[PDB]
């Protein structure tokens, strides 16, 4: 689950910090990426901190 | 034919210094300046130049 701007950067290539440190595609990756808002489900209405 | 030998081998190692429509013609500053992802555009067309 990633937040809304840094969808944007899984992309192979991308730079960014989940892309630096937590998951960057290799520059020959063959695959699809899917992605849908969430708000509804996961966010809490004082906070979510899982 | 000395001379036309000489000359033709001088060409050949004055071609080494062209751009061929790189950003430069110096391969570490190629390397080092731009990104891993996209570098490779300048690499290949330096390549076939030579």
Same mark, same amino acid.
């Given at each position: 689950v990633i937040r809304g701007d840094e969808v944007?950067?899984? /992309?192979?290539?991308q730079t960014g910090k989940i892309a630096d440190y937590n998951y960057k595609l290799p520059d020959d990756f063959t695959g699809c990426v899917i992605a849908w808002n969430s708000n509804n489900l996961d966010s809490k209405v004082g906070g979510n901190y899982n | 034919v000395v001379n036309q030998n000489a000359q033709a081998l001088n060409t050949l190692v004055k071609?080494?210094? #062209?751009?061929?429509? /790189?950003? #430069? #013609?110096?391969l570490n500053d190629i390397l080092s300046r731009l990104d891993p992802p996209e570098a490779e555009v300048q690499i290949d067309r330096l390549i076939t130049g030579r």
């Amino acid at each position: 689950v990633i937040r809304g701007d840094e969808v944007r950067q899984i /992309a192979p290539g991308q730079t960014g910090k989940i892309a630096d440190y937590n998951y960057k595609l290799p520059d020959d990756f063959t695959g699809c990426v899917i992605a849908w808002n969430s708000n509804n489900l996961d966010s809490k209405v004082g906070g979510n901190y899982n | 034919v000395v001379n036309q030998n000489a000359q033709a081998l001088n060409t050949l190692v004055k071609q080494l210094s #062209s751009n061929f429509g /790189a950003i #430069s #013609s110096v391969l570490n500053d190629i390397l080092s300046r731009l990104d891993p992802p996209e570098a490779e555009v300048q690499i290949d067309r330096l390549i076939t130049g030579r």
